[model samples]
Target chain A: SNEYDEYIANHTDPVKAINWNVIPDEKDLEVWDRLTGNFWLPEKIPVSNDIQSWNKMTPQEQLATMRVFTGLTLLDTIQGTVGAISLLPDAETMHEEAVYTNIAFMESVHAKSYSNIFMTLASTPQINEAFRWSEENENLQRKAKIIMSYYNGDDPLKKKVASTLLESFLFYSGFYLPMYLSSRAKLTNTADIIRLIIRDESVHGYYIGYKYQQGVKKLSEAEQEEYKAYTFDLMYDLYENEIEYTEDIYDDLGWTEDVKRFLRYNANKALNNLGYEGLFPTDETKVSPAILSSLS
Target chain B: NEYDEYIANHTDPVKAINWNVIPDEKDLEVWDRLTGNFWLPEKIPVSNDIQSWNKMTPQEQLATMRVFTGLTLLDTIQGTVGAISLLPDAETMHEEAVYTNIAFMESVHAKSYSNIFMTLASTPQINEAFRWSEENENLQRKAKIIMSYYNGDDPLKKKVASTLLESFLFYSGFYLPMYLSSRAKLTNTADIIRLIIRDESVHGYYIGYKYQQGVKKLSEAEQEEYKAYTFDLMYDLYENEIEYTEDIYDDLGWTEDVKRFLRYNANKALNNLGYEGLFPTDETKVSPAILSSLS
Candidate 1:
């Protein structure tokens, strides 16, 4: 018995051929179209061009970028193998299940592309140390555990809440540094990779949250009300951990304030994506205008 | 206790995959090979098959489309259900990475069949082939037999069923396009099939090798019990496959040759698992020209 049981426990249900001719949920088709049409590979980007960007950074700045990526890499693996894959068995339609497959695969694509950036920018000793950092980092592990608990939970809507939050809210704290660095002409091609990653994750959050919205409405009004509160608490809980991780990772570089703004911006985005009113208070001036535009 | 509780107790520490620190070299090697060979169905010139498709008799075209739908059915299962099922059974992170590639490529493989249908057949005909894929008795039986093992709790049995799909079940549909290609018909379509066959070959090797590792670890008595299960399952699958092949190719007088190809591929499956071949090589030797088209 293992995590597969979480997804497909006592699963004797028969599976049939997916006939593309019939459209069950038209949303699945649109998401599938958008995902495949926007498909990309890490190697296609000229990451080596960013080696010059890498050279201009201080050793500390380089270390900061590596840490942020390793942190981002860990979350990508969580979403790819655990989150997206878990959603399939609960999928209301076969087509919805199909898009999860693509999402899972692209998350793999995203995680490896981080390695591509590291392979291009950092040394073996530096790379290995960052991985060690990823392995033992306290806050990163906490965030993964929290999200995975929901993933392993039985409530399908709860799993979507966690997944949408992971895609839209959790990763942005780590994602902020790359965009922040891109504005400073650091890791430019790496920023190119992150832009591609952002585009896909934005779709993942919307679609998963859209499914959550669809599922929660089918519940009793009291149940729906409780779950909506559950989502807000979950977001607030994740934001607390995320704020700590952001301070731990970004404070040394003095990017902590801007990064927190990015986190709040994304938290609000995640809330709205889930069809809730934004819970995080924001100012249009919260992030520096340059960094704010990077998010949009 | 829940299954996740069992995993929490027994599993290795989970973390992001670090390629520099691989637990097993084979998984890493296979991962590199799979990612390096990435492809999409859209990149293939399936539309080129359309003009050639128009020249064929309606029966020939319908039969070809039906064969593809059956293959597509297997790819769909392998991609969406089978590979996802194998994730928990993976003994290493790199092993899971390999399965990730297998899952995505299986998606690509399934979509290629749709692309071919879109290009070469009418909308209703594609629907017709899919309905036939669902209702065909032999096809459903084989799917159930394999999928039942997927839903079964034994990790080793899952790999066994998966390797069967990768190695044996697919060639019944595979033979048609190779046969057509050898005749200089639908050769453009044959190229895509070749890509799928190559991908499946990688799949069989990694999955079968992983199964062999589990088999070697078992007690002597345990080995005997599982060996019996393997042979018994293969016998059931082959029985259904024989009927499936006969149903599809019998009308065109191609059943006997397709049967030979099925035998050849089953032996390939067994050999992949580090076992001796079950069929007589000479008897199961497929037509040399169709075999040539396989390369």
Candidate 2:
């Protein structure tokens, strides 16, 4: 009984989850589609349009970019961490927590990778501003944004609908969409890391959808209407503009196609997941018959 | 008894020697590297396209570099002490050795800095910029933490606790990353300070790892909690990184790259401790901003 409890407890922690090292069936068929069965391979290494290619830039330009990107990246990492903890709440549905765990590790790595870049820049023509930011420890406002988003209150049914809808938008737009576009444009299959990362993102998107689906079924008609309105506002804030209190990083850098494509696809995806068919303008456009006609 | 006699006979207490403002030969040797090689001008150096680092005369370069070195040494002394105050105790022989070595390294640094001031008094007015420690809240907070830990009876706990506090709270957060960035610059000045910083880092590494190991040995379940707690403490300390740097940066009138460099430099410092996100940088390849002091 004691051994059983230990096993169960450990099983619940995706951080300590066992994978293909010992067992065979590690693949998630749906999540694995993009890697082996579909288009989108990451570029071997991420290449910036202009900023990172050269070492020299004005002091203000460098700090502005550094602070914005680092803030965005840190926010993502923190949100990833939050998701890793929160996703564990749904243990009965599937092993979604495993994906969350992987996400947590990757986000931390991104945090490190960015941190490394920032430090190297700090050494010469050294922006003492960075030291100022470093000490400020209000390192990322977006991190604050994500952490502040989650809170429990009364009106259990209404809260569930509101929370689930908001969470779905976060996963679909905030994470999965960006990851998807990035994979399509810049992903590499050489190490299978891109595949692995995409697989995890897909799982994240699915898990959110699953949660929202369940919440919608359980909500009252009045609660459902209010949920739709709440979700619409959240979606606008997330996709069209930066989420409340989040860094406006995308606005600063002229949009990379990867970023633009992500927002479009993700908006459609979020709307589709919400059962709002043909709601978004872009997604409403009919697909060209080129690929379909070619198949025919 | 024999060990005591050997130490007693070989080592005179530092207090006994009247350490004059003037540096001895060895101090001068270190200062030559520390001050002699680093040159920051009132005007930025022409790193790209222009052909004359040599146009600046040796006297001019040395004179300017001395000012830079004096500033560096002064800042490092206070910074090093602030760092050491946060470290956990020396649990191993290696750690204890590092602790003593850091003390010695800083002692030399202090002496070298003092000598620079002594020499410069004839040339320029002295600046005791580092003396701001008296007013620095972070320093005062550290002193209070130590005092609280070591009241009277529980001396060992107090010692270890204070060292642990210093290790996690200060040394890792403060000295290590800056030292790493400085060393990576590969300047003669930094190389000289590198010896001091490297020695100090040994102390930092020892304390952090030992505390981690101690937690594991005692209670593995509590390991995550301790990690979380230490992270929070370091984050709190990092909040001060902005405040302190603002004053220093305002005085220095740094470059954007340098502003960014400070963040990157601090990140490089914290990374050595296995903590990340000390500063901001590009999304890939985490290294300090500059390839060298000149960069």
Candidate 3:
């Protein structure tokens, strides 16, 4: 009897059927299409393709990659668990709230992707140590705290600002290694998933920043002046913390200058994504795709 | 999210979720199950049902659209309000992450209904369904009741409210597409519904089981109070649900069949909560075709 239920049909798989035909906000539909269209599972990517790549890496090199991704997972966790959830009540539109759901859920998926990847490439004890490193690592916790503090602030626009900083600039310090290694033709498939993450972040950064600008436009002139200063100053604060963070991770490997340069380049693009002028300059050439695209 | 309690301690937001840090294996297990189960509505082709949709009488299409819109309201609530409310009350960070997945799944589930309506019904038909969902007494009452717990301070009762919604509440309307699919009509639409049913089925057990865990932490007298409260809540919801069932299914002369189907799922909801089935299991139950096509 149960077989009849199971066998007769391959069982598979909103808000109201979000009538796309009559959208409350066209941008919501636009972003939804982009996000859902960009749908990927870590399982879909054969990261197992990178297993052969993992076997050849130096231990220090492998340790760096493991620790970097765990940092990546932690940021994803904060965004999904708290940042995105906090932003839901402040959405300007119903469709905006719905998009946060997609963003939040995918953030979890992104966070989970590493756990899947870690199982493939690192030993269990190795994975355990990486998480410990994330917690104890001062720069890493400072970055998370910096972003999370704003999420807890009263200003919704600042929440978007903090989120954009996270989605855009903050991650690049950690992003450099997988992408750089893949340039050397190591862990190339792992880089494949990493780029998917980058692509999603690019969209998330742009959308939240755009919303931030909208909210800023509605503010008083004095407050507007106050915010741009706050925005740039916040980056200034993070950039310094990032320097100490960057040197700690990269100095021993002889890649300190290169990673810091990438960090500045990413910081500039992050500011630009937030509708501010460039802070660093154009970059990413040594990597796959040469550079991240402007925005999705 | 909790509106009242959150501002009192606004500064402490969760830092990061490490799958490495888990309170229970149940949290870890649910995380894996939910992520692996990810799907989108566009993955199913409802456009193929255009011909079957046209064959329906205007009333048939109208009621069907209303049924879907009814389901949509609840799904939207769960995603935006219900699931979010549970986050602050979660026993572990891993457990909270599980709610995030459920929240997003509910979000996608809400939109899937929209996807189907866009494919199978006219804009006029779709608009009326949305309007009806808002105007309908039973629909609004159900939201009011469930949301009372979501907005309330007690965390464990919130779990019971959400459990009832996912397991017992949604199935009355879930019956239509399965019934329609059993007749070999608009099968693509049923394809989407089955996924929702499967997710809700899992949610029912996981959330209800989570309730048992919470209840075990309480004294027996406190536990007994909750047990009695759950029954009282279900009884309130059950009476209103039948009114909704009659409103939707009576016109088609399929009222009793739907009632039996509701009873079957109500029992499953109880079983998930570690409670006895309140409905008689011996009744003329859900038919073979609906059961078979349920997959």
B1-295 in candidate 2: lDDT tens per residue?
2123333343321110011122233322332233222221112212321122234334433333333333333233222332233223434222322332233233344333333333333233233233334344444343333333333233233333333442333322233223333544213333334444444434444444444445665465665665564455345444544454444334434323333544554454344344565445572232343333223
Predicted candidate 1 versus true structure: per-residue lDDT over A157-232, tens digit per residue: 9899999999999988888887778877778788889999999999999999999999999999999999998999
lDDT of 1 by residue, B194-278 (tens): 9999899989988999999988899989988877778777877898899988888878889999998988989899878767767
For candidate 3, lDDT tens digit of each residue in A111-165?
Answer: 8788878888889899888887887888887788877777777889889988999
Q: Local distance difference test, per candidate?
A: 0.84, 0.36, 0.81
Better of 1 and 3 by TM-score: 1
TM-score of each: 0.93, 0.34, 0.90
Predicted candidate 3, C-alpha RMSD: 7.1
CA error at residue B123 for candidate 3, angstroms: 1.4
Query: Best lDDT goes to which candidate?
Result: 1
DockQ ranking of the models: 1, 3, 2
How displaced is residue A126 in candidate 1, in Å?
2.6
Total backbone clashes of model 1?
0
Backbone clashes in model 1, listed as residue pairs: none
Off by over 4 Å in 1: A1-14, B1-14
C-alpha lDDT of residue A139 in model 2: 17
For candidate 1, give the DockQ: 0.39
What fraction of native interface contacts does model 2 preserve? Answer: 0.00
